[PDB]
A paper describes a structure:
To purify these Birbeck granules, we expressed SNAP-tagged human [name] in 293T cells, biotinylated the tag by incubation with benzylguanine-biotin, and immunoprecipitated the Birbeck granules using streptavidin agarose. We conducted cryo-electron tomography of the isolated Birbeck granules and reconstructed the repeating units by averaging the subtomograms. The resolution was improved to 6.4 Å, which clearly visualized the alpha helices and enabled us to generate a model based on the previously reported crystal structure of the [name] trimer. We then performed a two-body refinement to visualize the spatial relationship between the two opposing [name] trimers. An in-depth analysis of the interaction region between the two CRDs revealed that the interaction is mediated by a loop at residues 258–263, which is highly flexible in the crystal structure. The interaction between the two CRDs appears to be maintained by docking the loops of two [name] molecules into each other’s lateral cleft, which constitutes the secondary carbohydrate-binding site. The interaction between the two CRDs is flexible because the first eigenvector of the multi-body analysis represents an approximately 30° tilting motion with the loop as the fulcrum. The docked loop 258–263 may provide additional interactions with the hydroxyl group of mannose via Glu261 and Asp263, thus increasing the affinity of the secondary binding site when two [name] trimers form a complex. To investigate the importance of loop 258–263 in the biogenesis of Birbeck granules, we mutated three residues in the loop: Met260Ala, Glu261Arg, and Asp263Lys, and generated three mutated [name] constructs, each carrying one (MRGD), two (MRGK), or three mutations (ARGK). In contrast, the internalization of the pseudovirus was significantly inhibited by the ARGK mutation. These results suggest that disruption of Birbeck granule formation by the mutation of loop 258–263 inhibited the internalization of HIV pseudovirus.
Upon contact with Langerhans cells, pathogens are captured by the C-type lectin [name] and internalized into a structurally unique vesicle known as a Birbeck granule. [name] is a type II transmembrane protein that is composed of a cytoplasmic tail, coiled-coil neck region, and carbohydrate recognition domain (CRD). Through the coiled-coil neck region, [name] forms a trimer, which is functionally important for oligosaccharide binding. The calcium-dependent carbohydrate-binding capacity of [name] CRD is essential for the formation of Birbeck granules because the removal of calcium ions causes them to unzip and disintegrate.
Residue numbers in the entry:
A (entry chain E), B (entry chain F), C (entry chain D), D (entry chain A), E (entry chain B), F (entry chain C): 146 to 325
Write the structure that this text describes.
């Protein structure tokens, strides 16, 4: 009866760490498969809008228009595309916008509003004077002829924003935030 | 010997139920892994065609041409691209076509046939008059000048189809179904 | 005690074989999950460049320019985009280039060097005379006016290369290899 | 009869020439007398308002208030005195205003208005950016707290204008043009 | 002798007409110069008192004190300045007084006398109840505490007179008539 | 010929007599008009300085400060106004100063100089101690605390001068002579 005990008790160990290891593997595998499922569904959601002629950058779909429209008409078209004239909130966003622009001028959300005519984004994004000055073309805004109250990206460089009358047609970047 | 049995028999229940759980987890993890492998290979199949200047929608690849050509010349080019002039079979197809068109005009598979000029699709897609009724521009088809026997999408709206002579150049949407 | 042995020894076979099966599962699953993780990260690396207006083919990103520039100006722009004028090294590359070109003309890395004007690639790619002859338009190179010392793809066919002076403006295909 | 002729003809010369001199005297003395008449009327008109505690400068009466009022209330009091918060249209105007101020702060016609919040004069005097540039205290306007939309003379120097909220009580310079 | 007579008679007539006209000039010019000399003398008389910090109105000199005094002390100071506390005999005088006051309160010649306490002027000016009725502040005189027996100009309006005990200090308007 | 002579002789006599009278009146009128023109020029010169809040007395312009300053700071301000701290050269000037002061305190040009500290005027006016003694407040100068080396006018009387330390802030009378 000694040999059977010296066989059973190590069986007790072996199956206890066996069950413990199986539990650890099941929990870790469940977590990892849930994470990869989220990753794949997010990627699939990414793919479709980009496949329909839209660009993507930092959680925003940007449609670089094939047809030119005026600042407010461009905003209307972007709204019809459930979007707005692109509002730049960072260095990287401006960089991507003027790089994908390929040298083309795109109306953006910049417009003079308020009692002081301060600049603002059409999509109600806050206008950071300090940050915006770095994105503005040198000498701009100058309000040439006192009629330059809308902004557009012209230069393929960080300082791409020029002020100009809202009334004239341009290509435009329709911006709508990514949502899962 | 009683303690040995009271140790052996619960070991029987434990290892039996745990091997059953092993069977369950093996089968579930397997089915999920071939499922995700199929999803991965399908998305890989999807991505390359889009990466080469093509658009995709509901299992069909649509090329919105950068060069305008006539109706039958566009059909020839699409055939050379293993495709055809896009035939519209659903609300979603027409919507996607005119939205990705971005206001541009694209030849489609609409063409008259026979002595009475019944409309039909070039890619042998059946043409349902009642179903295709609301896809036509109002007043169209009118066969203006009695020479309007091919269809093209102009308006960024559901009523975008217009009949017009087949002999003039326009942009075109080459359509070939996605095949894995 | 005989029944105890006849019950516990098969427990030995069962637990050893199931531990071996668990080992097989762990190793195979670990290898497969590492492989699919690598595939996922490579796919993520691929997708963003194409999502920003670029094309992709066999580990090389090709930007088909929206703005035309001369041979050396196009090379400068491509370098600014961390790339070069595309050098064609295979049948597949030439085919993809003239197919995604959509009938458009693009400057490539072809250039003459030295007093004898031996042809070569700008990106230091070796120039295969035998292979390149199959890619050159018939009658080309001809050095029309003794001034045609660069190369561009015009025809949507295998024999797409025509020689031309380096100083004339054309669209261009910026080429940079895919790096993980 | 010779002597009477030689006496009477020079009588003709003398009385004719002195009648001419009489005409010259009449015209000159007249012109001078009504000229000094208008001058005397103008000085009598000038003296009366000055005698009533008002100051005078280049055809404008400026009442340097003995009681402080807010910008809008100061304008109300000035209007009640058939005047307005003083505008500044010249170097001499600003100089006289801050010199007669004697170091005291006086509300002036400066106020932000219009879609761009541009500065303007309460008395409807046109406001020139370039002209009024040097009349502002250095660093002003700064719109401290984004609430400084009226102007007052503080410094006993050319750069006397500081922007401030219109709601603060200050001495004020009532301005009304001299009218004959 | 005929010609000399036909020259002499017009000589006499012209000499007589010229002499009469010169008499007209002499008399008219003498009268005008004497009148303007008197006016200039009066202007010189007027200007000197005003130049010494005094105000002037319709033949009276009014000193608006910079230091407050009690009613009787103010009267003593005015007497020392060869004047008296100002008495108001017309609407224009009251208007000038309160307008030059600029909202400030000034002791005036109002004082009660006799066992019934009838009001009167300190400078022996007759007191018109009917006229003074419209110069008192509405509700005044009320003789608050039965101790209000002196008058001061308070309001920036015609009804500026307020009654108060004579023992408190106010600014004061010393009044002395203009005499050539 | 008798009658014509008895008419000619009175003609000559009257013409000569009234010609002499015209000469006399011309000279007298010219002198009077030149004198009154000079007087009017002087009056126009006088009026402007007084019109800007300044006082005048016997060829000197005195500014009674609305803001107080220390003795040396008052002198600096007076110099900046092209003037100096007022010096007294006559009894009438002292009378005018303390009467226009209206009981207020004003710094004057009295200051000690040299190792014996003899008194003198800041504007280099000679010190008439014989006349100055009649203008000092009784008991003054006393040099209280051996630190009283400047002069101030406080008392509304001829004896208005008091010695006092130069470092404290009083009102001041800026004095500058009238020059045509």
């Amino acid at each position: 009866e000694v040999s059977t005990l010296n066989a059973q008790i190590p069986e007790l160990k072996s199956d206890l760490e066996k069950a413990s290891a199986l539990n650890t593997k099941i929990r870790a595998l469940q977590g990892s498969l849930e994470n990869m499922s989220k990753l794949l569904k997010r990627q699939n959601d990414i793919l479709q809008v980009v496949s329909q002629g839209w660009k993507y950058f930092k959680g925003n779909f940007y449609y670089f228009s094939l047809i030119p429209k005026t600042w407010y008409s461009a905003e209307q078209f972007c709204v019809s595309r459930n979007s707005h004239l692109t509002s730049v909130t960072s260095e990287s966003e401006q960089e991507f916008l003027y790089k994908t622009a390929g040298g083309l001028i795109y109306w953006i959300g910049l417009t003079k509003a308020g009692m002081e005519g301060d600049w603002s984004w059409v999509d109600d994004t806050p206008f950071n004077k300090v940050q915006s000055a770095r994105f503005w073309i040198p000498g701009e805004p100058n309000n040439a002829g006192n009629n330059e109250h809308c902004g557009n990206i012209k230069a393929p460089s960080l300082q791409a924003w020029n002020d100009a009358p809202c009334d004239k047609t341009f290509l435009f970047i329709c911006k709508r935030p990514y949502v899962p």
